[PDB]
Amino acid sequence: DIVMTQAAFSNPVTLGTSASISCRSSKSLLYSNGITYLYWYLQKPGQSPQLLIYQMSNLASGVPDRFSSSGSGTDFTLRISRVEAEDVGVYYCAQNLEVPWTFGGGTKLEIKRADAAPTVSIFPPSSEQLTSGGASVVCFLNNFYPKDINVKWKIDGSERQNGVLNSWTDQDSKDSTYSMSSTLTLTKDEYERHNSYTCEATPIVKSFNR
Amino acid sequence: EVKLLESGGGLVQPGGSQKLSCAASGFDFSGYWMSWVRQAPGKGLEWIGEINPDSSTINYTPSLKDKFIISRDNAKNTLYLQMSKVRSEDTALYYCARETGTRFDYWGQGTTLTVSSATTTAPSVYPLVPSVTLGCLVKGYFPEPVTVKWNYGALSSGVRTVSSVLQSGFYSLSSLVTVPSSTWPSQTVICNVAHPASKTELIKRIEP
Q1: CB-CB under 8 Å, A49 with B95
Q2: Whether residues A76 and A131 fall in one domain
Q3: Domain boundary at A113, A130, A153, which?
Q4: Are residues A3 and A53 in the same domain?
């Protein structure tokens, strides 16, 4: 099988600036008919892949002329000029000079933008949950950049890591920020034993008293 | 117009067989090559194989030829993928695709197959109540995926849904929406949670 290599992440790319994602082939994709059997696909978060470019020089329908590709047989470059926020996603190179079709590992396009602090929101457990024997406290950090952020929980001013689950969104299609949620899950008893619940982003702090 | 609706996923125990279907519409399905490609969770793409219009030519990834059988019923406008002797490594989202690498390239939305000896478990769902930000918290489910929409999908701007987290054999996630303070609580906001594997469909009204 022909092996397609590409990096897992692009260098961070400022909006309005040109991105370049490279891909390398273990055998030449130029056939003796002069055509280079290279394809580019974009996969946007939560969506199936979409063809961008087929056989080097052809644009799929509805794809902007900002997307171009070039390369000498074994080594290629997807160029995206004037990068927009909606271009964010995973770019896959692929071939079918030879069966089977193979794809590259995918390259996540990283958009660079102004630093932004999160808008922070804290959610006490619903009354609904309490009968379950659990109580989940949720911290939501909305629309920040860059991705690396830290959330700390404090119950009655004391730091609690047990029962905490964190998860992020992908980079947003319209503003190029991230959001993330942190959930502190306790028992109904632990939650009712204590009063003050705090989360803090890293210094933005939101809190409530039960 | 052009559609590729997929089904036949869910959970299956190791060693088992499973048959996925891809129902086409909005084109002369009998005149196109069709393909199957899969994507394991958090990973890239693997082409499985393809099949010509009349079914006289069927190509496979060599290492998947024993396990996978691609067929089709043009009279039913349907594509099939039959898997047998399935293993944990076959857990993935399976896409069917029309005529890949050409002007006609189009991919279906995908169906998830999970190979596991564990038990499909329905989610519990809780509202996240205090521009204003609302959410719901979805916990305790297996397997993946769950989908979370707001007002059936009609409310899209401002929605932030984090990736799922696995812990102690079960998944959780949360979806939040930010909405003008003049709109809520004055107007209805609902989150729709589906867990296809357990055939779960539920709605939570977000209320003061």
Answers
A1: yes
A2: no
A3: A113
A4: yes
Residue type, A82: R
Q: What's A135-178 look like in SS3?
A: EEEEEEEEEEECCCCCEEEEECCEECCCCEEEEECCCCCCCCCE
Suggest the residue from A3, A43, A123, A188 to mutate for an interface test with chain B (most B CBs closer than 10 A).
Answer: A123
* Structural domain that includes position A65: 1-113
Name residues whose C-beta falls within 8 Å of residue B118's C-beta, 6 or more positions apart in sequence. Answer: B11, B142, B143, B169
Instruction: Answer whether B49 sits within 8 Å of A100, measured CB to CB.
Output: yes
CB atoms within 10 A of CB A30: 18
What residue spans define the domains of chain B?
A: 1-116, 118-208
Method: X-ray
Q: Could you tell me the fold of the domain covering B118-208?
A: Immunoglobulin-like (2.60.40)
Q: What is the DSSP letter of B152?
A: G
Question: Measured between CB atoms, which of B46, B126, B165 is closest to A165?
Answer: B165
Whether A140 and A190 map to the same domain: the answer is: yes
Class for domain B1-116, per CATH? mainly beta
Does the CB of B130 have a partner CB in chain A at under 8 Å? yes
**Resolution rounded to one decimal, in angstroms:** 2.0
Structure tokens given for A191: 């939650």
Minimal C-alpha gap between B12 and chain A (Å): 23
For an interface test with B, the pick among A37, A126, A139, A147 (most B C-beta atoms closer than 10 Å) comes out as A126
> Of A70, A94, A113, which closes a domain?
A113
Residues A138 and A76 both lie in one domain: no
CATH number at residue A1: 2.60.40.10
CB-based contact B59 A99, cutoff 8 Å: yes
Tell me: do A126 and A185 sit in the same domain.
yes
Handedness of CA A35, A54, B104, B18 (dihedral sign): positive
* Closest chain A C-alpha to B25 CA, distance in angstroms: 18
